[PDB]
From Swiss-Prot, chain A:
This is HAUS augmin-like complex subunit 4. It is found in: Cytoplasm, Cytoskeleton, Microtubule organizing center, Centrosome; Cytoplasm, Cytoskeleton, Spindle. It comes from Homo sapiens (Human). Belongs to the HAUS4 family. Component of the HAUS augmin-like complex. The complex interacts with the gamma-tubulin ring complex and this interaction is required for spindle assembly. Interacts with EML3 (phosphorylated at 'Thr-881'). The chain holds residues 311 to 363 of 363 of the full protein. It comes from the Eukaryota. Coiled coil: none annotated. Contributes to mitotic spindle assembly, maintenance of centrosome integrity and completion of cytokinesis as part of the HAUS augmin-like complex.
From Swiss-Prot, chain B:
It comes from Homo sapiens. The chain holds residues 224 to 278 of 278 of the full protein. Belongs to the HAUS1 family. Widely expressed. Expressed in pancreas, kidney, skeletal muscle, liver and heart. Weakly expressed in lung, brain and placenta. Residues 26-54 form a coiled coil. This is HAUS augmin-like complex subunit 1.
Protein backbone atom coordinates (compact mmCIF):
# COMPACT_ATOMS: atom_id res chain seq x y z
CA UNK A 1 0.00 0.00 0.00
CA UNK A 2 3.06 2.22 0.33
CA UNK A 3 4.49 0.86 -2.94
CA UNK A 4 1.64 1.59 -5.36
CA UNK A 5 1.11 4.84 -3.44
CA UNK A 6 4.68 5.80 -4.40
CA UNK A 7 4.12 4.75 -8.02
CA UNK A 8 0.78 6.62 -8.05
CA UNK A 9 2.51 9.77 -6.79
CA UNK A 10 5.24 9.36 -9.43
CA UNK A 11 2.64 8.93 -12.18
CA UNK A 12 0.72 11.96 -10.88
CA UNK A 13 3.93 14.02 -11.00
CA UNK A 14 4.57 12.81 -14.57
CA UNK A 15 0.98 13.67 -15.55
CA UNK A 16 1.28 17.14 -13.97
CA UNK A 17 4.41 17.69 -16.05
CA UNK A 18 2.53 16.44 -19.13
CA UNK A 19 -0.28 18.98 -18.52
CA UNK A 20 2.03 21.86 -19.51
CA UNK A 21 2.30 20.73 -23.14
CA UNK A 22 4.64 19.57 -25.86
CA UNK A 23 6.80 22.70 -25.52
CA UNK A 24 7.61 21.68 -21.95
CA UNK A 25 8.26 18.14 -23.22
CA UNK A 26 10.83 19.62 -25.61
CA UNK A 27 12.23 21.53 -22.62
CA UNK A 28 12.42 18.23 -20.69
CA UNK A 29 14.33 16.56 -23.54
CA UNK A 30 16.60 19.60 -23.98
CA UNK A 31 17.46 19.83 -20.27
CA UNK A 32 18.01 16.06 -20.15
CA UNK A 33 20.51 16.35 -23.03
CA UNK A 34 22.15 19.41 -21.42
CA UNK A 35 22.44 17.70 -18.03
CA UNK A 36 23.80 14.51 -19.63
CA UNK A 37 26.51 16.54 -21.38
CA UNK A 38 27.02 18.48 -18.13
CA UNK A 39 27.57 15.28 -16.14
CA UNK A 40 29.85 14.00 -18.92
CA UNK A 41 32.07 17.07 -18.46
CA UNK A 42 31.78 16.92 -14.64
CA UNK A 43 32.82 13.26 -14.43
CA UNK A 44 35.82 13.91 -16.69
CA UNK A 45 36.84 16.88 -14.52
CA UNK A 46 36.50 14.78 -11.35
CA UNK A 47 38.48 11.91 -12.90
CA UNK A 48 41.27 14.28 -13.95
CA UNK A 49 41.32 15.77 -10.44
CA UNK A 50 41.57 12.27 -8.96
CA UNK A 51 44.38 11.37 -11.39
CA UNK A 52 46.29 14.56 -10.52
CA UNK A 53 46.15 13.65 -6.82
CA UNK B 1 6.36 -6.56 -4.74
CA UNK B 2 9.71 -7.54 -6.29
CA UNK B 3 8.56 -6.85 -9.86
CA UNK B 4 7.03 -3.51 -8.83
CA UNK B 5 10.31 -2.49 -7.18
CA UNK B 6 12.15 -3.68 -10.30
CA UNK B 7 9.95 -1.67 -12.68
CA UNK B 8 10.25 1.32 -10.33
CA UNK B 9 13.91 1.73 -11.37
CA UNK B 10 13.34 2.69 -15.06
CA UNK B 11 10.25 4.74 -14.15
CA UNK B 12 12.14 6.64 -11.44
CA UNK B 13 15.16 7.00 -13.74
CA UNK B 14 12.97 8.63 -16.40
CA UNK B 15 11.25 10.72 -13.71
CA UNK B 16 14.68 12.01 -12.61
CA UNK B 17 14.79 13.99 -15.88
CA UNK B 18 11.71 15.97 -14.75
CA UNK B 19 12.32 17.12 -11.17
CA UNK B 20 14.97 19.67 -12.20
CA UNK B 21 12.37 21.78 -14.06
CA UNK B 22 9.86 23.97 -12.26
CA UNK B 23 6.30 23.98 -13.70
CA UNK B 24 6.67 27.37 -15.41
CA UNK B 25 7.71 27.42 -19.10
CA UNK B 26 8.71 31.10 -19.01
CA UNK B 27 11.11 30.63 -16.10
CA UNK B 28 12.19 27.36 -17.74
CA UNK B 29 13.30 29.31 -20.82
CA UNK B 30 14.87 32.02 -18.62
CA UNK B 31 17.06 29.47 -16.85
CA UNK B 32 17.64 27.36 -19.98
CA UNK B 33 19.48 30.46 -21.20
CA UNK B 34 22.05 30.02 -18.42
CA UNK B 35 21.87 26.24 -18.90
CA UNK B 36 23.19 26.74 -22.44
CA UNK B 37 25.67 29.30 -21.07
CA UNK B 38 27.01 26.90 -18.43
CA UNK B 39 27.29 24.10 -21.00
CA UNK B 40 29.36 26.42 -23.20
CA UNK B 41 31.35 27.42 -20.10
CA UNK B 42 32.14 23.86 -18.96
CA UNK B 43 33.13 23.00 -22.51
CA UNK B 44 35.76 25.67 -21.74
CA UNK B 45 36.17 24.87 -18.01
CA UNK B 46 38.02 21.66 -18.90
CA UNK B 47 40.36 23.63 -21.18
CA UNK B 48 42.62 25.34 -18.63
CA UNK B 49 43.46 22.16 -16.69
CA UNK B 50 44.51 20.54 -19.99
CA UNK B 51 46.46 23.72 -20.80
CA UNK B 52 48.33 23.57 -17.48
CA UNK B 53 49.02 19.87 -18.07
CA UNK B 54 50.37 20.52 -21.58
CA UNK B 55 52.37 23.66 -20.74
Amino acid sequence: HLQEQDMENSRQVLNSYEVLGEEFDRLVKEYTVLKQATENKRWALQEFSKVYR
Amino acid sequence: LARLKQQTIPLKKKLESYLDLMPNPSLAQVKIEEAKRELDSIEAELTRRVDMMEL
